[PDB]
Structure 1
Amino acid sequence: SPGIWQLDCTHLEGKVILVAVHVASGYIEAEVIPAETGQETAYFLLKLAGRWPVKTVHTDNGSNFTSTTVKAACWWAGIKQEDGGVIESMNKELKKIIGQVRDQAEHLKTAVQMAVFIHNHKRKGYSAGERIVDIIATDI
């Protein structure tokens, strides 16, 4: 459970938001990209694995599961690349937060990082940021 993450992809303003969800805590990392490609997904996973102890990733679709570039990043970072409700509600929640801050940000990427901040600090009482740290520290 502590090393399991789920990839998720959603569209907004003609752009793609790639999200990594830490399944046990609900903690997220997200980035805005022009379109989902194997190279963008591979780079996102390399970043995530250098920051958190990523053991397994459930890919968001069969193209990212199949991608030789994604498989190479998973090999490099020591990640077990795996296949495939609450994710749909999290995409809706993220878009809701983005809408609420959209006026404070000129760039979509700024609004997305503001939403990541709000989601991870929301007490619902522990926050997702507190839960991920507690889950991983117990495993050490």
Structure 2
Amino acid sequence: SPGIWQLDCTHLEGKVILVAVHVASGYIEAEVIPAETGQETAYFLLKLAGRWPVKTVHTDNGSNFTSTTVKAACWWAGIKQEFGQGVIESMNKELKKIIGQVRDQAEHLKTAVQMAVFIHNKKRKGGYSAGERIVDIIATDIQT
């Protein structure tokens, strides 16, 4: 399903990383956030939904989506909580792997995360990349 995303946080070096995975393609978007708050998650969601067609968001920590600030962002953006796992487990551990491998290519973690996001979305797997699959899946879906 073209509009389903998975969202979780992961910790590294005393910092929080928010990771969103487009489930049908394995494409990721991540950000280093100051703290694991409702505000940060709501904000991230509103950004994601202006960039990709976000219909439903799945998470492995259900309580992350209970703040007033997260429901308000999902209400405004039209998002529902997905109620329907191999790809996501692979994508997150893979992310930390690439983070580990590019960590010395940058001073701060936040740069290293974006370098790993880039590496991950471009790597062909076969065999297209996740970034090629997500636009392929979205382009086909637009046209009926």
Q: Give the corresponding residue for 1:33.
A: 33
Distance in 2 (CA, whole Å) between partners of 1:56 and 1:86 is 16
Q: How much has 1:83 moved relative to structure 2? A: 5.0
Q: How much has 1:44 moved relative to structure 2? A: 0.3
Distance in 1 (CA, whole Å) between partners of 2:83 and 2:34 is 24
Moved over 6 A (4+): none
Number of residue pairs matched by the alignment:
140
Q: Say yes or no: does 1:86 pair with 2:87.
A: yes
Q: Give the corresponding residue for 1:103.
A: 104
Q: Give the corresponding residue for 1:126.
A: 128
Distance in 1 (CA, whole Å) between partners of 2:119 and 2:25 is 15
In 2 relative to 1, CA 6–88 (structure 1 residues): closer, same or farther, beyond 3 Å?
same
- DSSP-derived class of the 2:118 partner: helix
Q: What is the aligned-residue RMSD (CA, Å)?
A: 1.4
- Contact kept in structure 1, 2:26 and 2:87, CA below 8 Å: no
Structure 1: gaps spanning 5 or more residues: none
- Contact kept in structure 2, 1:9 and 1:60, CA below 8 Å: no
Q: How much has 1:137 moved relative to structure 2? A: 0.7
- Contact kept in structure 2, 1:42 and 1:70, CA below 8 Å: yes
Give me the identity figure in percent.
99
Moved more, 74-83 or 19-28: 74-83
Q: How much has 1:100 moved relative to structure 2? A: 1.1
Note the alpha carbon deviations across 1:83-126, whole angstroms, 9 max, x for none: 57543332221111111111110011100000000000010010
Distance in 1 (CA, whole Å) between partners of 2:110 and 2:2 is 28
Q: Give the corresponding residue for 2:7.
A: 7
Q: So what's the TM-score if we normalise by structure 2?
A: 0.91
Note the alpha carbon deviations across 1:115-140, whole angstroms, 9 max, x for none: 00000001001000000001011111
- Contact kept in structure 2, 1:94 and 1:115, CA below 8 Å: yes
Moved more, 107-116 or 92-101: 92-101
Structure 2: gaps spanning 5 or more residues: none
